[PDB]
Amino acid sequence: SGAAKHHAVRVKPFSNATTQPKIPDGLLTSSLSRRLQNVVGVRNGNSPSVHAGSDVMHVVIAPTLGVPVMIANSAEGVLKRPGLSQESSFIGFPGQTVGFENLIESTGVPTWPPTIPTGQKLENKGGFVLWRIISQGLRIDLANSDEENDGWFEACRFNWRNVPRDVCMTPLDGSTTTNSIGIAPNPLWLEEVGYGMAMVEQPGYKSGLLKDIKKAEFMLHPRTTTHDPTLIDPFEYGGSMTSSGGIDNVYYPSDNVSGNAVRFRDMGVDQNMDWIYIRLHCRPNNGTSSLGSNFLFNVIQNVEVAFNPSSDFAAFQTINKADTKTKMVADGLNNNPDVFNGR
Amino acid sequence: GAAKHHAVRVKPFSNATTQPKIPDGLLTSSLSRRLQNVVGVRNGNSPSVHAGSDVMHVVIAPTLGVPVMIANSAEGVLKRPGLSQESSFIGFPGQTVGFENLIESTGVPTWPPTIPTGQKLENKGGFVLWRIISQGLRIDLANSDEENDGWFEACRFNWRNVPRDVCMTPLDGSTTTNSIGIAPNPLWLEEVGYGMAMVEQPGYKSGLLKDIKKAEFMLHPRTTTHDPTLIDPFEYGGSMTSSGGIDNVYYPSDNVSGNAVRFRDMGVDQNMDWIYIRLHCRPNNGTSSLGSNFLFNVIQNVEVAFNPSSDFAAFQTINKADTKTKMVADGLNNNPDVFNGR
Amino acid sequence: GAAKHHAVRVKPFSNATTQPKIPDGLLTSSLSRRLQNVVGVRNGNSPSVHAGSDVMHVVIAPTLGVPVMIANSAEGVLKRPGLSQESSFIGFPGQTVGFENLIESTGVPTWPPTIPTGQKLENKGGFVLWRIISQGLRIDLANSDEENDGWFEACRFNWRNVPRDVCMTPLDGSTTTNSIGIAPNPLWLEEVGYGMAMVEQPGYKSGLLKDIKKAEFMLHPRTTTHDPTLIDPFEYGGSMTSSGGIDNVYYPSDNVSGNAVRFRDMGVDQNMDWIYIRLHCRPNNGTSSLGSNFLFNVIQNVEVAFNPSSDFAAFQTINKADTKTKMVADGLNNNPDVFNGR
Amino acid sequence: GAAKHHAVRVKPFSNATTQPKIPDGLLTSSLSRRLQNVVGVRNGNSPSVHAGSDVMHVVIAPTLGVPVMIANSAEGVLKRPGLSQESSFIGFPGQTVGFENLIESTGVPTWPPTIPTGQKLENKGGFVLWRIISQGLRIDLANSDEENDGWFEACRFNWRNVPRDVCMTPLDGSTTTNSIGIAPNPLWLEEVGYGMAMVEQPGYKSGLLKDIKKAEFMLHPRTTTHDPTLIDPFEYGGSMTSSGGIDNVYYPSDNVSGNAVRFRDMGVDQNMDWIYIRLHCRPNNGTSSLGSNFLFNVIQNVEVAFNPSSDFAAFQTINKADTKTKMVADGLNNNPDVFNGR
Amino acid sequence: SGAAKHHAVRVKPFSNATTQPKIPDGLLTSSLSRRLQNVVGVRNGNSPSVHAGSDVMHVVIAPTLGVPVMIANSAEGVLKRPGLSQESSFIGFPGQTVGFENLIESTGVPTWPPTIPTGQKLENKGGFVLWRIISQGLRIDLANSDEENDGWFEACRFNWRNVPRDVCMTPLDGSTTTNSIGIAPNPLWLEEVGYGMAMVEQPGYKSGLLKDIKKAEFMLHPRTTTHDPTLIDPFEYGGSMTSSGGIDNVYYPSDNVSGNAVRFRDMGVDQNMDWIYIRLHCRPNNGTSSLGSNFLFNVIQNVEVAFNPSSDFAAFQTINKADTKTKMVADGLNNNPDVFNGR
C-alpha cells in the first residue's frame, strides 16, 4: 500500500522510500513534510582549559527543531566558542523551511546576536506552527586512516528531564553570527546531567570501537501512542533569556520557572521522542603529534508540518490518511531499547 | 446508539439524535448540547472602511459560543460603524454556554469591560471541559430572480494559532448584553484573510450565490483522539484591549502574554480547522442597489463535562467507546472540499 | 503477559504484579510503584468548627502523593485545630514520589515555607512524567458489632479544575515533615462539597456503615490514551499562601497566576475523576463515646519515566502495547456507580 | 496509486491530488503545481474598438503562466484602452512559474522593457523542463436570473504555430508588475479568430449563456508521449516589439527571427490544442446596463523538473510509469467536442 | 513464554532480553535482580620491577560479589599500586546496590582503609543477604589503531581451589580510597596458581590474536543442578584480615584456617560458578617507543537477590516462577568447555 513508504521512513530515518514522508495516523488533516538533513565533518578538539587533558567528545542528539545535534569538545567548537558553552558545535538544517529570525521587537529590524535586555522577538519563518518528528537518525563514520582509527565509544538513550535550560537557540548553520535560528540541546545539560551520568546503567546502553561506529545507526524512538504535534507559540523576550555573555552567542532561558522558559521548552522540543547521549573516546588531539579522530556526521530529522494559508507551501499540502499498521510499526520500533542498530 | 452519534459527526444538521457524543469514551460522564442560531445577513453599505467594495467576508471558526464573524455586513455597519471591519457576529445566546464579565474587586457584572481596572471573565456554563462534535454553516440567498446575482469562494485552512485572531463579544450579536462568547477576531482578515490566496488552498471551491443554498460548510476534525478543551480561570487588566470605540470587541493586547495564550487555548477547539468564505454580492450603495440578503443557519454540536455544582450535572450520561469512530473521522476529513451538497 | 496489568487496572488492590503498567506503549522505558497506605481514622470531637457534628467528609482525588483528605477526623482535630476544616491527610511517605521545599537562594530545605521569601519545591523523584494506572480506597468500620450504626453516601464527579482546590502538605500526614505531596484542598468542601446535593449526582450510592467493609471506591480513567502529567520546576513567593496557622496546608493564593495553573496541572492527573464521600458516624463527645473508628486503605498505582540521574533508571522495563487496553478501560468506566462490591 | 493522476488528467478541476503527474516515467524526478485562478469578467463598453459590440472573444491556449486572453472585456477596456483589442489576461501570479524582465547589461529588473536596449527575460522558476498535465476553463454566468440571456459558441483547433500569436504580459493581469508569463496574443484574433467561421470547425458547439455554468472546456493532449518543453535563455533587443502604448503586451517583431521561434517554442506546450470561444453577451452601455458578468475559473496542471539551485528540488518525487496512461489520454482526446458536461 | 527472556539472559549475559532477569527455578520466592555492568579502558603497564621485561597482562574474571575482574600489569595498576599487589587494577560495580562499607566496630564511624588491628566491621549495604549470579560475561576489544594491533592471548576456565586467600576486598570503583567495598579475586592467586599454570592442558583452552579478541566473549558457566544462593553473614575482623601494608589497600584473610577466612570466602564468592583466567600477550610498553595495547573491557554480572523488609527495594520484588526449561538451558550452556565463543 501507499503507507508502506511512510512506515519505512518511520523505522529507517535515512530510508529512500519517499521524499515526502508522513505519520499516517490522520492527525494532521492536510500537511506537508520535509526531510531535513546535514552532513558535516567533525573532529575532537584540542582545548586549553575546558577539556584540557580530555579525548572525549560528547554528542547529544535531541528532538529539537532545527539543530538536533550538539557536540562538545570538537575542533569546530574550540575554534568558534573558545572556553565558552563547553566549546561545543552544532549541526543544524540551514536553508530549509524551518527556523526563526531574531528581531528587535519595537522596530522589527532583524538582529543577531540579540541586544538584550532590550525587547526581542523570535519570528517564526517556517509558515507553520504545528510540527512533529516522523523519525530522527544520526550516522557517525570514522574518517581517519587505518593507522589512526583507534578509540571507542559508548551510547545510551534516556528520558529527558524536561528542564527548560537544557535547550537553547543557536544559528541553524552552526555559526555564531547568522540570523537564521534553530533550537538545540544546551551544553549546560552536559555539566548538570551528561558528564556525571552513569551511562552503563541506562537500559539499552551499548559500546564499541570507533573503527566500527560506521556500522552503527542511532535513531530516536517515538511513543506507541498517538504522536501529538508541537505548537509553535509567539515568543518575545527581554531578560527572560540569557547567554554566557561571550562571543559564543548561545542563548537559553535565564531560569526554569518563568512562563517564557516553559513556553520555549514546549515549543522548541518534540516531547514525544527520547534523547540519545554518545561519548566518543577519540584519538588524542594535542596539535603536535596526535591530531584527533575525524568523523563524518550525517543527521536526518524527518518532520511533518501543517502549513498556514499565508505560506506559499500551503498549495503543496497533501491529505494525511490514517493507516492500520501505524501503531504496531511504532511499537515494534520502540520495543528494543538498544541505543544503536546495524545500518 | 453509535450510528446516530456518527451520523451527527459527519452531518452537523442531522436529526439522528438530540444528545450526540464522540463515542470514544474520553469523557466518562458528559452531556451535549446542539447550539443553533438562524440570522438574516446582508452585505453592508459602508462609508469608509469597505467603501465601494461588494465583498462580504465570513469566517467560521471552532470558537466557543460565537463561531461566525461576518465583515462588511449591514448589521456590522449599523452596530460597529468604522470599527472592527464593521463586522457582525452570530452566537448562541440563551443556551448553556457563555461567560459573564465582572469587575474583579467588587464582583459587579460589567459590559463593556472597564480596562485597566481588574476584570474577571466568569464561566457561567457550569463546565470546564468542552469539545465540538461537529460544526456546520448553511447559507441561502434570499433575493428575487431579478436580484440574485453574485458568486462566492471558500476554503478551509490550518489556523496559525495567533491569540489576537480570537476575541470576546456578546453571544447574541449585540455590543452590550454581557453574555459573552468567543469569536474569530476581525483582525485576522487584516493580517491573513484579505491578502490570502484562496485559490491555492487545497479544497478551494467557488460558485454562484444563487446556488449557495445547495452547499453546506462544516469544519473537519482530526482522525485521532479529539481531546477536550479546558476553560481556565481568567482575570485581566491591560492584558486585553479593544478598538476603544463602541464596537466593544475585546482581544489580547499582544500575542505573548500568559493571558493571551490562556485566552487562545480556552476559547478555541484546536482539533478543528477553520473555513473562510468570500461572498461577492450584489452592490449595496444605498440608492440604486441594495445588496444580497442571506439566511445564515449555524449549528455547533458541543459535548461538555458538567461540574457537580451545575443544574445540568444530574442529566449527564455515559460515553461508550465505539469501534468505528476513527473510520468515521478519517472518512469525513479525507476530502478537503470546503463545501458539499446538503 | 498483560493480563496482570489489566487486573491491576480494574482492581487497584489486586496482587497480580508488584510492577503494573498501562500497556499502551506510551512510556517506552518506565517503572511503576504501587503506593499504598493503611491508616485508622475516626470522626473527631471538634470544639468549634464541627462542634456537635458526626459527619466525616472524605475526598479521593488523583493528586500525586496525598490522594485522600478527611475533614472532621480526630487526627485532623488534633493536628490542625480550627484550621483547614480540621482535616487529615493520607499520603505515601517514604516511597519514591514527593517534593522537598527549599529556600530558593540557599537551597537549604525548609518546612514550613518562609513566605514571602523565595521558595523552591524541588522534585525529589527521579521522574518528571507520571500517570495513575488505577486508584482505589477501601474503608472498614473497625467498631465493635454493638456500635456498628451509621450510614454513608458517595458520588463521583467531574472536577471543577480550580487551582485552589489542591494543596501541598507533608506526605506522612503530619504538618512538619519536609516530604511534600499534593492533596485535595479542604477549601473545596467549603466551596463545593458541603453545599452539594449528592443524591442528584449520577452514580450516587448510599449504604450502611456496617456494610462499607463490602464496598470499594476507585477512580475511573478514560477509555482513550492516558496521557501522562509533566512535573514542571516550581518556585514561589507570594503566589502560594496558607491559613497562616500551624496546619501548614499551602495552596495557590489565587486561581489566575501562572504558578496557580502550573501547580494545578503538575499535581493532578486530569484523566481521572474525583470521589466525594460523606460518612455519618456515631457521635464523639471526647470522653465516653469515641464515635466510629475506620480502617482506611488507599492504593495509588503510578507509572513514571525515570530520568538518567535516578538510581531507578537501571530497573526500568519496556512498556509493550496491548490490544485489550481500550476494552479494559471502557469496561471499567462504563459504570458510574461510586463503589462496587469488594 | 496512479488513479489520482489519471483523474486529474481527465478532470483538470478534480480534487484527487494536489501534486498530479503524467505517470509515464518521462521526468524521473519532478514536482507538480496546480496553477489556478478565479476572476470575474464582464463584457466591456469600448468607445472605439468594440463600440456597440456585445461579443467577448476568449482564447484558451497552452501558454506558460497566462493561458487565457479575453478581448472586449471591461478590464481590457480599462487597462488597455484602444490597444491590443482591449483585452484582458488571466494568469497565475504568485505561484512558482514566471519570468522577470531585466536590463541585460546591469541585471536591474525593469518593466516595461526598454526597447531597443538589450533586455534579458530571466526564468524565475527553478525548472527548465515543463509540460501541461491538463488544462481546463469553467465559465459561470453570474448575472441575475432576470438578465441571463445570450449565447456562446466554441471550437478547438490545430494552432497556426506562428510566433506572433503569443505574447508576454504580467502574470497578475496588470500592465506594470514585473512577473511575466506567456499568453495567446490578441493579434491572433485579428488574423484568424475574427474571420473564422466557427460553425464549420469539427467539434464546434453552441449553447445559451444561462447553460454555460453546466459546461467545461479543456484542452486535449496527445495519446503518445507528452514530451516536455524546454525554456531556453532569452535575450532580446529589437527582436521583440509592442503596440508602443501603455498596454505593455510584447511579442516577436517578426515571425522569422531566431528569437521569434525560440520564444514560440519555449512559451507553448505544442502537444496541446487551442480553444476559441465567442460569448454573445448583454450590451454594456456603461451607465445603466452593465452587460453580462461571468465567473472565469482556469486551472493549468503543470509538471516540471526542478534544477538543483531550487529550494523545491528537495520536494521532488519519483514519476513512475503507469500502464493506463495511453488509454486515458486516448479516451480523453477521442471526442472533439469543445466542451463537456461539468 | 515469559521465561524466554530469563533463559536468554542466562545463556547470553549481555543480552537485551530483560532489565530484571531471574533464574526461573522458584528458589527465591520473592526477589529482585540487577544487571551490574562496567566499561573501562585498560592498557598493559610499564612496570619497573614487578613485571619488568613482561608484556603479559593477566586477567581473572571471578564470580565474586561486586568486583569480578582483576587485571595484573595494567597501566592503572602500575599507577595505583606501585610494586604492590602485582600492580593490579580492579573493575567493579560502583553506585549499584551491592557492596559493603568498612566501619570502626566500636564507634560505627565509616573508615577506609581499615585501621587494623583495631576492630573493624564490614557493613552490608545492599539490603539483602541471599544472592546468586544469573550469568557473568566479559568482553575485551583491542582499541589500538591498525598499525599497533599486534599480540595474542590465551584463556581457560577452571575449577577454583576455594582457598580463602585467593579472594580479597577492594573499593568497588577501582580506587584505593573510596569506602564502597566489594569482593575481588586476589592477585595472590596469580603467583600461587596463575603464573605457573599450564594453561594449554586445561580443557576448553583456546588462543587467538589480539586483533580478533573483539570477536570473543568470555562467560562463566553454572552447574546444571539447582543454583543455591550465597548467604552474606555478619563480618567483623581485627587481625584476621591483612594487606601488604602499602597504599594499595587490598585486604584479604591473614590465613586460610581461621573461621573469619572461611566465612569471608563463602560469603564473597558464588561457588556454583567456575573461574576464567586470560593472558594477554600485548604490544610492549616501555614509555618511549611502544605504548602497549589499549583495550575496552566490558563486564556484566547479572545477580538475583532477595531483599530484606528494611530495604526500600523490597516493594519492587516480583515472584520467581519455576520454568521447565531451566535445567536443560543450563546443561546446554555448560556442556561446552570452550573458554570463549563468538559474540
Numbering used by the authors:
A (entry chain A), E (entry chain A): 46 to 388
B (entry chain C), C (entry chain B), D (entry chain B): 47 to 388
Give sentences copied directly from the paper behind this entry:
The structure of the ClorDNAV capsid was determined using single-particle cryo-EM with imposed icosahedral symmetry. The final reconstruction reached a resolution of 2.2 Å, with local resolutions ranging from 1.82 to 35 Å. The ClorDNAV capsid has T = 3 symmetry and consists of 180 CP protomers. The asymmetric unit contains three quasi-equivalent CP subunits, designated A, B, and C, following the nomenclature previously established for CtenDNAV-II. We were able to model residues 46/47 to 388 of the 390-residue CP. The three CP subunits are nearly identical and adopt a canonical jelly-roll fold composed of eight β-strands arranged into two antiparallel β-sheets (BIDG and CHEF). In addition to the canonical strands, the structure includes additional ß-strands in each sheet (I’BIDGG’I’’ and C’’C’CHEF). A third β-sheet, composed of seven antiparallel strands formed by loop extensions between strands C-D (2x), E-F (2x), and G-H (3x), creates a surface-exposed projection domain. In contrast, in ClorDNAV, all C-termini are oriented toward the capsid interior, similar to subunit C of CtenDNAV-II. As a result, ClorDNAV contains two interior-facing helices per subunit, whereas CtenDNAV-II contains only one, and only from subunit C. In ClorDNAV, no such density was observed, and positively charged arginine, lysine, or histidine residues within the interface region either face outward (e.g., R80 of ClorDNAV) or are positioned much further apart than in CtenDNAV-II.
